[PDB]
Design an enzyme around this catalytic site. Structure first.
Site, PDB file in Angstrom:
ATOM      1  N   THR B   1       0.861  -1.206   0.000  1.00  0.00           N
ATOM      2  CA  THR B   1       0.000   0.000   0.000  1.00  0.00           C
ATOM      3  C   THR B   1       0.884   1.238   0.000  1.00  0.00           C
ATOM      4  O   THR B   1       1.931   1.276   0.650  1.00  0.00           O
ATOM      5  CB  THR B   1      -0.896   0.067   1.250  1.00  0.00           C
ATOM      6  OG1 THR B   1      -1.938  -0.890   1.080  1.00  0.00           O
ATOM      7  CG2 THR B   1      -1.483   1.454   1.493  1.00  0.00           C
ATOM      8  N   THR B   2       0.407   2.269  -0.661  1.00  0.00           N
ATOM      9  CA  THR B   2       1.015   3.561  -0.517  1.00  0.00           C
ATOM     10  C   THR B   2      -0.068   4.639  -0.614  1.00  0.00           C
ATOM     11  O   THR B   2      -0.879   4.627  -1.529  1.00  0.00           O
ATOM     12  CB  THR B   2       2.076   3.778  -1.604  1.00  0.00           C
ATOM     13  OG1 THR B   2       2.878   2.610  -1.798  1.00  0.00           O
ATOM     14  CG2 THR B   2       2.950   4.974  -1.257  1.00  0.00           C
TER      15      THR B   2
END
Lengths: 271, 201, 221, 228, 206, 234, 227, 208, 227
Positions: B1-2
């Protein structure tokens, strides 16, 4: 069983609470109690009932904690009661417990007005919740604190309180309140206050000479601080003077009763 | 995730990727990681999807009740505080959550970070997730307060792109939102593989 | 009257007045009828600004009420819940005789204790189980009656008078003649019956408990 | 039932507490005398008939090894106070490993009386007590009434014949009596008010001396009755 | 111990300083968080720990102190009474179900006379506390990995009669030595003085 | 636990316990509030002047938070309990939302406490009416009143307690929009002296401005009373 | 004297009959349903000119598609409307859709009947007006916990009068203008004072948009002039 | 003793413009053995337009099916007899799974049905209830085979079907899964859901 | 005359009037009779019908409480049904905890205890039924009656309700040591047909049950052909 409920916490038809009014009538039948604010302290005085020969002492080890009419709450707060005696003991225990819990939590003494406000909230509760009779007690409270100095409060059966320079509760409280309204002044000493208290009790009791066996007197005053153990408490700081509650004995009253009889014999002379 | 967000002169930009991975198998490439709480506030999810989605829906319910009872919009400081009290009360029960909350109220644009232990911090720039450690590299090189809206969107897009190219747990579609005085807008959605062809020159 | 205020006071002649008065709530509700043949039960009701009088309780059972609606709804939620638990534990329909017993028992707890009020509502419960069709009437005193035909509510004596003439012929009737006998009984307790003020409900063999739509009810009104 | 049965009336009176106090003042006569080295308490125990066993009737109770009591009024109400008092004495020993002072025990009892004048669903107790005991501050005799009020006395009496007994004690009491002269005085004061013949079987006596409380047996009491 | 806090009292003031760092494992999120919080007109507390417990603990103390103020005619409470209440909340939590508040504090205040009846000795006070509920009045004190370096410096250089200028200089040397010797980066400090005139930021320290 | 029903309907739709509570309020001392441009004044009658009373008078206008004050009429001991509840709610709100509480939201909390007392088994209503005033975080002044039933409304000027209906007719005529801090103090003193006898030490007064509160001293108050006693002769 | 749970000899609960009397001493409120829209309106009735009329709203929003007008005891009504609001948001939380108007009427009645616990019933009736898939609707709740659908209804002091005006003029097929007008007519008649634009409230929910709109002062006057 | 058991097998679905097709295998596995080859508990009808499909522990899907059936019955009693939509049931399911966060159902679930426009939709859940709407889905022991194949044939990112052609693709995907996963086999029950109604069909697989 | 409003108060004469009033409800109800033979016990009761349209078995007054024991109710039937539930629970407790069928004398004493407790407390009223208990466990055939006061006794034969004075006369001309359970059914039914009053109650039927050796000590209704 609900048809025999007397409905103690129910308003009646002019916004009145009848149990609260009736308990106030009980107070007005009790032994007279006087309080006086001076520059050196507070004085509390009470009439005792007639003195039977077969009465005894409890013979308690420390004599300045409780008399017949005067009770210590903490080192800086004392009181005197009128009304139902066993009800007074129940509220006195509540006050003792409240004032000493504050000291546990903050390590400093409870303010006088704060203690008075807790006590009155305990009375208000029984007039609003729970289906039983209210307490039938009125207190005079004497205190000292760093916020307002010497104070004298009175509490009533509704849970209201007020502050006074002098006051009276019990039997002859309109007579006593009239004499105080004449002879009180902003520049009284502790000893002048004690004499002014004995003369007011003298008048309401209606005896020419003051019996030392029919009176009780207590004072809340400031005395020199004791030890200052800077070896055991290296950051402990006491002040010069600390409050004390004291119940006067028959060997401290003897000279002050003399001065109250002379002023009685020079007030019967001018007339 | 970012995920990342920052505050510039013209408001707040938020941007995210779209992959969900255990740590080997890729369960989806089309998760929406910006939560439209209502029409003046946004959230983001990182950590556990289910925890972020459930508690952000709870927070949207609390915001709408506030509006019904008081006839005005809740502030960003209060909304973020409601979420941080919840996470703090469950701090011993094992949630995983790293959210941003963004909005524009009467004191202007505000951006907060809130985590699963009750943490709550206000600052001008954040990145969160396993790819954050790549996105901060590009973002700290390009960020300033005086960016135009178009420049700020580009900076945010290029930063999520570089995280997707190096972190195994990030990828998919890059989405950019703009939080302004009139509420918020979805600016763009772009596959990270189409972006590679536009930036390799 | 010194004995008419509480449910916990017997009168000197052995009566319970508060329970007789709750039973007047029922007798002043709007009328409802029920009838049964070998394999069906029919309920009809005057529902005139629409006021809900019939309720489904499970696939195999429903009821009509008369009296206080908010008490009606409280009993409907209790029976619903009971039928759902029975099916969870057994995978089959809750038997109608056990439904009628728990309802009776719940009414009675509310006529013996000072912190409870009697229920002011009457039910006609209709259902179909493994032993056939059943029709029960329950009242605020806690009694439960098992019937071939009956009526409750305002002017329900006329409806009951009509049913006493015809009921012995109902076992042989078909579903269509049974529905008609139920509307002619309800008519005797009454403006005339349209599709906008009358409810018809049915339950039986191969038929889950259902309320006719306005289309389907046209055929009979 | 959870409403109060004791309430204020227009002149400020609590009448159920007066009525309970009237029930206490119609019980049979008990008394107490404090000497300079102990205390004596005594009470009448006449039965209604000689079919009753005298021995088992108790009017004087041990509360702990240093303190005891007697009562006038409603006996079954007294049993409730005697059980509460016994329990309080043992609880005090568990915490401080010494005997509960009589001043503290009386205050405990007094607060139990005060609750039955205010709580919901209860009437007040219909008995007065005399409590006698020894501790570090000496020998003590106290009276407690249905209001919860208590007093310390040198000598006193409760019950039916209580006014004449108190007049008789006022004359004969001195601050310098020994314990044995007090037992004499107590038994003489009872005899005045007694209807019939005082015997060692229809009277009961307890004594504090040398820091201990003890009931006399029938035999011990006979020796004292043959001297008076 | 990832954040260092320092304090010391001299004749008419207390100085208090704390590092700005907020971290997530090995990443610096920001380095300008203010951790020296003002409790009333003449009092501050500096706390070291994770954001969640730190913020929830100082808001609980602030709320109870505001309540106590208005049930007392708005009079300033003494520093020893505030210290006593904090210690009792830390010790309480240690034996509670939720567990201890993992925070370490330094509380500083300047006591001022309530009225003309007040016989309180006016002056500055400083109390060291730990997360367990230990509490001791001290002339100087520190928490965090940097603590041991600074304490030794102050044992060498502190005096009670430092002027305001000498004290600000001494606080800057203390902060520089934390930056020099501690691996965990503590790059910005925020400092405040407590005096008879209230609480002010010292801008020349960082 | 006593759980009797105390407040019930009677045959023409009356709730007698609530009307009796409203009678205790009309017996109480008079209280007045006045909203100006950038100030709110609260003024209250005091029991009486005595030689024996203590100069430091017990306050009958209460602070609920830095920016909100409360005055009342009715049973003083019941009012102290209500003040205590509202002080806790102001702090509970800061703990939960960080911001300071709005005045209208704190008034709703208090009204809801009063309403519940009229429907809870085992307890009677509070015999109290309140006036509550303050400033939001954008400098706008609010002034509200609540009664013993729980009904709340906003006012520009208002009065409660004895002779409320007289003081309210006077105020209906004379009130003007956008008054000054001193013009408001005048208007409030004037309104009170329709009910009260003298104007010596039988008035206390609080002036509330955006970020400042003042219990008026005896000297500043004497000045304002003589100015008003002069204008009442004309 | 006689308890809260007692039945009368004709089978009514006394406290519920008295609560219904308290509602007939209220300010007047009404509603009219058309095929296009539903309209609700209320007499405000302020006690003096010193009161801000904003603060005395008799028309409340429950959710975007539903609104209420109340009659009887105002403080009791606020408890019910808080419950309706909380229920309508719980329905959105769990099922991601707006709550139907009839279900919201039903939920409010399940609170109104729990006394015997509360000392007495609520002295309140509501008119609830909204739009869902069955179109524009108007429901009434009352202290007996019964709820009923209506085409036009009034509640309060002027109720009996307004049901004679409805039995003359109301047909099931009117327009938004004819209903807006019938509202302000009935109010003028049954009121005490003279009818200004700051002395009544009006709101509509139309099938077209399905949102609730509360009319300003400006827009009310256009409806007074059209008379 | 553990409170968990994995009973094996596989589900899959594909949506179309106005249908959805849903399939589950019929084998119920124990420890190193087979309890039966004809279990029908993987698919469960909730309304005429909506199904639940589950893999994992069989006792937990039996509980979840019954809890949903009762919440849907209460919804009809409180809403005038009307049934909830596919989207309303999908959000209810998410909320019920998260409320058991602390002792979770050991289940991998799908909700499939028609939306309001009449098109197919599939919602897939992790065990605490995160989901999203999609055009196809699978879970269970063979899901890591079937899912990349569906990506290949249906989205074609490296390069409108009829009901009939869509059903043939699923037949071929299950046949492949039965050859290579040891816990999937015996038969597939297929449901085809349209606005009209629901058609069913049984399809044989390898028995080893 | 305030002394008769609750069961928690004695009158000056030492009576509890609410319990006497509850007994008057039993004395006005339909008649029941029972007899203890050497084989078993037989019970029979008159049911007054309120309609000619009832199903058979409606408002049954006789109920099994275990395999070997049964109860018949006189007076108010819904009150009786609450006692039947209690009795069922005591019989189950005896099997589950002590592994025995409850002896007849023990079952009767628990039913008595349960009924008595409702004569002691201001908030409850006494039951308005008397219960006949018939049992055949390891203590032989047993017949008991418990009334609203909670008083319990054992009988060879008994009658209750409005026909009881005459019915008692006719039970005294039976021989209890000798009679069988098939004779008993004929005699008991005869007594009930003879005391029936045809003016007041027009429609009625009889209900009959037994427990004996013939039935294998199983308590049951007699087959409807034996009447």
């Amino acid at each position: 069983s609900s048809r025999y409920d007397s409905r103690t916490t129910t308003f009646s038809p002019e916004g009145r609470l009848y149990q609260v009014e009736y308990a106030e009538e009980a107070i007005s039948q009790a032994g007279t109690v006087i309080g006086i604010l001076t520059t050196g302290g507070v004085v509390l005085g009470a009439e005792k009932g007639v003195q039977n020969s077969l009465f005894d002492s409890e013979n308690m080890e420390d004599k300045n904690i409780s008399g017949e009419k005067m009770y210590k709450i903490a080192s800086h707060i004392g009181c005197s009661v009128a009304g139902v005696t066993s009800d007074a003991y129940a509220l006195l225990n509540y006050a003792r417990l409240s004032a000493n819990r504050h000291h546990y939590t903050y390590q400093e003494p409870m303010a006088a007005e704060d203690l008075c406000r807790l006590l009155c909230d305990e009375k208000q509760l029984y007039t609003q919740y729970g289906g039983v009779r209210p307490f039938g007690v009125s207190f005079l409270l004497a205190g000292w604190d760093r916020h307002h100095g010497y104070q004298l409060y009175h509490t009533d059966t509704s849970g209201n309180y007020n502050a006074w320079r002098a006051y009276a509760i019990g039997q002859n409280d309109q007579v006593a309140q009239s004499l105080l309204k004449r002879d009180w002044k902003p520049e009284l000493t502790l000893d002048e206050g004690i004499v002014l208290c004995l003369r007011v009790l003298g008048k309401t009791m209606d005896t020419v000479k003051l019996s030392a066996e029919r009176l009780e007197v207590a004072v809340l005053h400031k005395v020199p601080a004791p030890a200052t153990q800077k070896l055991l408490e290296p950051y402990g700081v006491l002040p010069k003077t600390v409050p004390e509650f004291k119940i006067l004995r028959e060997t401290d009253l003897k000279p002050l009763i003399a001065e109250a009889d002379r002023q009685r014999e020079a007030e019967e002379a001018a007339e | 995730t970012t995920t990342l967000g920052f505050h510039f002169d013209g408001g707040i930009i938020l941007a995210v990727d779209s992959r969900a991975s255990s740590g080997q198998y890729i369960s989806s490439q089309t998760v929406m990681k910006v939560l439209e709480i209502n029409e003046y506030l946004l959230g983001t999810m990182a950590g556990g999807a289910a925890d972020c989605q459930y508690w952000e829906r709870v927070l949207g319910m609390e915001c709408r009740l506030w509006e019904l009872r008081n006839n005005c919009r809740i502030s960003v400081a209060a909304a973020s505080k409601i979420l941080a009290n919840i996470t703090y009360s469950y701090r011993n029960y094992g949630l995983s959550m790293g959210t941003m909350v963004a909005g524009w109220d009467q004191f202007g644009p505000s951006l907060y970070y809130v985590d699963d232990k009750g943490t709550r911090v206000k600052h001008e720039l954040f990145s969160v997730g396993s790819g954050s450690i790549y996105a901060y590299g590009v973002l700290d090189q390009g960020y300033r307060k005086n960016l135009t809206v178009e420049e700020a969107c580009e900076l945010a897009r290029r930063s999520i792109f570089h995280a997707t190219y190096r972190d195994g747990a990030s990828g998919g579609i890059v989405t950019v939102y703009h939080v302004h005085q009139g509420g918020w807008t979805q600016i763009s959605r772009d596959d990270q593989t189409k972006l590679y062809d536009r930036y390799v020159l | 009257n010194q004995y008419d205020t509480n449910t916990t006071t017997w009168s000197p002649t052995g009566r319970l007045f508060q329970v007789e008065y709750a039973n007047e709530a029922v007798n002043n509700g709007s009328a409802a009828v029920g009838t049964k043949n070998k394999d069906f039960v029919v309920l009809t009701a005057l529902k005139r600004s629409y006021q809900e009088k019939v309720f489904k309780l499970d696939d195999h059972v429903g009821m009509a009420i008369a009296g206080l609606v908010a008490d009606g709804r409280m009993l409907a939620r209790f029976v619903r819940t009971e039928c759902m638990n029975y099916r969870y534990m057994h995978d089959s329909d809750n038997p109608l005789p056990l439904i009628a017993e728990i309802v009776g028992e719940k009414y009675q707890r509310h006529i013996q204790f000072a912190g409870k009020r009697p229920f002011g509502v009457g039910l006609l419960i209709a259902g179909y189980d493994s032993t056939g069709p059943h029709l029960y009437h329950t009242v605020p005193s806690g009694d439960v009656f098992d019937f071939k035909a009956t009526a409750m509510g305002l002017r329900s004596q006329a409806a009951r008078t009509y049913l006493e003439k015809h009921f012995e012929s109902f076992p042989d009737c078909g579903l269509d003649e049974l529905i008609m006998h139920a509307l002619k009984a309800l008519a005797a307790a009454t403006a005339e019956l349209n599709i906008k003020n009358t409810t018809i409900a049915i339950v039986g063999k191969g038929t889950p408990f259902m309320v006719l739509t306005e289309e389907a009810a046209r055929k009979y009104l | 039932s959870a409403y109060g049965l004791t309430t204020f009336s227009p002149s400020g009176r609590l009448v159920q507490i007066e009525y309970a106090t009237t029930a206490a003042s119609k019980g049979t006569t008990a008394l107490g005398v404090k000497a300079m080295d102990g205390v004596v308490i005594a009470a009448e125990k006449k039965t209604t008939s000689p079919l009753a066993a005298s021995l088992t009737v108790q009017k004087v109770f041990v509360l702990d090894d240093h303190v005891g009591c007697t009562y006038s009024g409603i006996g079954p109400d007294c049993r409730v106070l005697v059980d509460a008092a016994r329990k309080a004495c043992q609880k005090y020993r568990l915490t401080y490993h010494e005997p509960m002072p009589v001043s503290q025990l009386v205050r405990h009892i007094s607060s139990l009386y005060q609750e039955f004048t205010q709580s919901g669903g209860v009437r007040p107790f219909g008995c007065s007590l005399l409590v006698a005991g020894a501790d570090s501050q000496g020998n003590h005799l106290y009276q407690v009434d249905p209001s919860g009020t208590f007093w310390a006395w040198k000598a006193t009496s409760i019950g039916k014949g209580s006014t004449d007994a108190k007049t008789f004690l006022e004359k004969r009491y001195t601050n310098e009596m020994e314990i044995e002269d007090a037992v004499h005085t107590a038994l003489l004061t009872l005899k005045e008010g007694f209807d019939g013949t005082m015997t060692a079987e229809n009277t009961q006596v307890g004594r504090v001396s040398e820091g201990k409380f003890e009931l006399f047996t029938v035999d011990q009491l006979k020796d004292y009755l043959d001297q008076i | 111990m990832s954040e260092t806090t320092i304090a010391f009292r001299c004749n008419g003031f207390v100085l208090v300083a704390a590092a700005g760092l907020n971290a997530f494992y090995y990443i610096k999120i920001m380095d300008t968080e203010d951790k020296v919080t003002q409790l009333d007109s003449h009092k501050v507390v500096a706390c070291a720990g994770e954001n969640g417990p730190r913020v929830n603990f100082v808001e609980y103390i602030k709320c109870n102190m505001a309540l106590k103020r208005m049930r007392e005619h708005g009079r300033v409470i003494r520093t020893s009474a505030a210290a006593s209440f904090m210690r009792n909340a830390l010790a309480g939590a240690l034996r509670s179900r939720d567990g201890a508040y993992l925070v370490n504090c330094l509380l500083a205040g300047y006591d001022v006379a309530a009225s003309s009846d007040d016989d309180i000795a006016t002056g500055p006070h400083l109390y060291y506390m730990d997360y367990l509920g230990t509490m001791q009045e001290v002339p100087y004190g520190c928490h965090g990995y940097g603590a041991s370096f600074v304490i030794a410096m102050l044992d060498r250089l502190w005096r009670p009669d430092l002027t305001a200028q000498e004290a600000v200089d001494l606080m800057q040397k203390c902060c520089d030595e934390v930056k020099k010797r501690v691996v965990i980066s503590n790059d910005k400090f925020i400092c405040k003085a407590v005096t008879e005139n209230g609480v002010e930021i010292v801008n020349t320290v960082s | 636990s006593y759980d009797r029903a105390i407040t019930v309907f009677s045959p023409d739709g009356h709730l007698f316990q609530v009307e009796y509570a409203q009678e205790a309020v009309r017996k109480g001392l008079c209280a007045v509030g006045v909203r100006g441009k950038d100030s709110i004044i609260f003024a209250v009658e005091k029991k009486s002047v005595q030689k024996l009373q203590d100069s430091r008078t017990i306050r009958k206008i209460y602070k609920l938070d830095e920016h909100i004050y409360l005055a009342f009429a009715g049973l003083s001991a019941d009012a102290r309990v209500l003040v205590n509840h509202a002080q806790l709610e102001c702090q509970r709100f800061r703990l939960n939302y960080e911001d300071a509480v709005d005045v209208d939201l704190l008034v709703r909390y208090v009204a809801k406490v009063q309403q519940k007392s009229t429907q809870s088994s085992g307890s009677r209503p509070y015999g109290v009416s309140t006036i509550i005033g303050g400033f939001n975080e954008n400098g706008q002044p609010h002034l509200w009143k609540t009664d013993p039933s729980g009904m709340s409304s906003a006012w520009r000027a208002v009065a409660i307690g004895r002779n409320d209906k007289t003081v309210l007719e006077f105020m209906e005529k004379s009130y003007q929009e956008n008054m000054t801090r001193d013009q408001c103090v005048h208007f409030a003193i004037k309104a009170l002296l329709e009910a009260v006898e003298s104007g010596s030490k039988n008035i206390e007064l609080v002036v509330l401005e955006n970020k400042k509160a003042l219990y008026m001293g005896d000297d500043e108050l004497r000045k304002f009373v003589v100015e008003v006693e002069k204008e009442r002769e004309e | 004297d006689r308890g809260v749970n007692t039945f009368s000899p004709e089978g009514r609960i006394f406290q519920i009959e008295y609560a219904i009397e308290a509602i007939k001493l209220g300010s007047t409120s009404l509603g009219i349903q058309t095929p296009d829209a539903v309209v609700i309106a209320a007499e405000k009735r302020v006690p003096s000119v010193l009161v801000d009329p904003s603060s005395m709203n008799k028309i409340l929003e429950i959710d975007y598609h539903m609104g209420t007008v109340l009659s009887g005891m105002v403080a009791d009504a606020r408890i019910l409307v808080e419950h309706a609001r909380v229920e309508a948001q719980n329905h959105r939380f769990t099922y991601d859709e707006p709550m139907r108007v009839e279900s919201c009427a039903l939920a409010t009645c399940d609170l109104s009947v729990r006394f015997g616990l509360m000392s007495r019933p609520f002295g309140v009736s509501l008119l609830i007006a909204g739009v869902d898939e069955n179109g524009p609707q108007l429901w009434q709740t009352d202290p007996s916990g019964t709820y009923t659908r209506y085409d036009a209804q009034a509640i309060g002091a002027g109720a009996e009068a307004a049901q004679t005006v409805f039995n003359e003029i109301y047909h099931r097929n009117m327009t938004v203008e004819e209903a807006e007008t019938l509202a302000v007519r009935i109010l003028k008649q049954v009121m005490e004072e003279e009818l200004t634009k700051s002395n009544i409230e009006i709101a509509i929910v139309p099938a077209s948009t399905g949102k609730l709109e509360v009319y300003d002062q400006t827009k009310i006057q256009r409806i007074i002039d059209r008379l | 003793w553990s409170p968990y058991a994995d009973n094996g097998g596989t589900i899959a679905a594909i949506a179309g413009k106005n249908y959805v097709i849903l399939g589950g295998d019929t084998r119920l596995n124990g420890d190193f053995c087979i309890h039966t080859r004809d279990d029908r508990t993987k698919l469960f009808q909730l309304t005429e337009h909506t199904f639940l499909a589950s893999t994992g522990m069989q006792a937990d899907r039996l509980q979840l099916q019954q809890m949903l059936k009762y919440r849907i019955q209460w919804y009809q009693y409180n809403n005038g007899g009307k049934l909830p939509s596919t989207k309303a049931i999908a959000k209810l399911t998410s909320t019920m799974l998260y409320q058991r966060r602390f002792f979770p159902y050991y289940t991998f679930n799908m909700v499939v049905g028609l939306d309001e426009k009449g098109a197919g939709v599939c919602y897939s859940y992790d065990p605490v209830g995160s989901t999203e709407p999609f055009r196809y889905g699978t879970s269970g022991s063979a899901s890591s085979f079937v899912e990349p194949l569906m990506d290949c044939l249906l989205t074609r990112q490296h390069m409108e079907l009829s009901m009939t052609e869509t059903l043939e693709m699923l037949k071929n995907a299950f046949t492949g899964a039965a050859e290579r996963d040891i816990f999937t086999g015996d038969a597939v029950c297929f449901h085809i859901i349209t606005a009209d109604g629901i058609r069913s069909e049984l399809f044989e697989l390898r028995n080893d | 005359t305030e002394h008769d409003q609750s069961t928690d108060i004695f009158s000056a004469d030492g009576r509890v009037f609410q319990v006497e009033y509850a007994c008057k409800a039993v004395d006005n109800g339909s008649t029941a009779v029972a007899a203890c033979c050497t084989d078993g016990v037989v019970v029979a009761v008159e049911k007054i019908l309120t309609s000619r349209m009832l199903e058979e078995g409606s408002n049954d007054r006789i109920h099994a409480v275990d395999r070997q024991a049964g109860v018949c109710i006189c007076g108010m039937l819904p009150d009786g049904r609450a006692v039947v539930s209690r009795a069922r629970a005591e019989a189950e407790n005896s099997r589950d905890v002590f592994a025995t069928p409850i002896p007849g004398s023990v079952l009767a004493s628990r039913i008595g205890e349960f009924m008595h407790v409702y004569t002691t407390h201001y908030a409850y009223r006494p039951f308005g039924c008397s219960v006949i208990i018939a049992s055949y466990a390891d203590d032989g055939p047993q017949l008991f009656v418990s009334d609203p006061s909670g008083t319990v006794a054992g009988y060879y034969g008994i009658a209750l309700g409005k026909g009881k004075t005459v019915a008692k006369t006719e039970l005294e001309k039976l021989n209890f040591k000798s009679i069988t359970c098939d004779e008993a059914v004929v005699k008991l039914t005869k007594i009930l047909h003879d005391v029936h009053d045809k003016s007041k109650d027009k429609l009625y039927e009889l209900e009959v049950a037994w427990v004996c050796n013939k039935s294998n000590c199983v308590f049951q209704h007699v087959p409807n052909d034996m009447i």
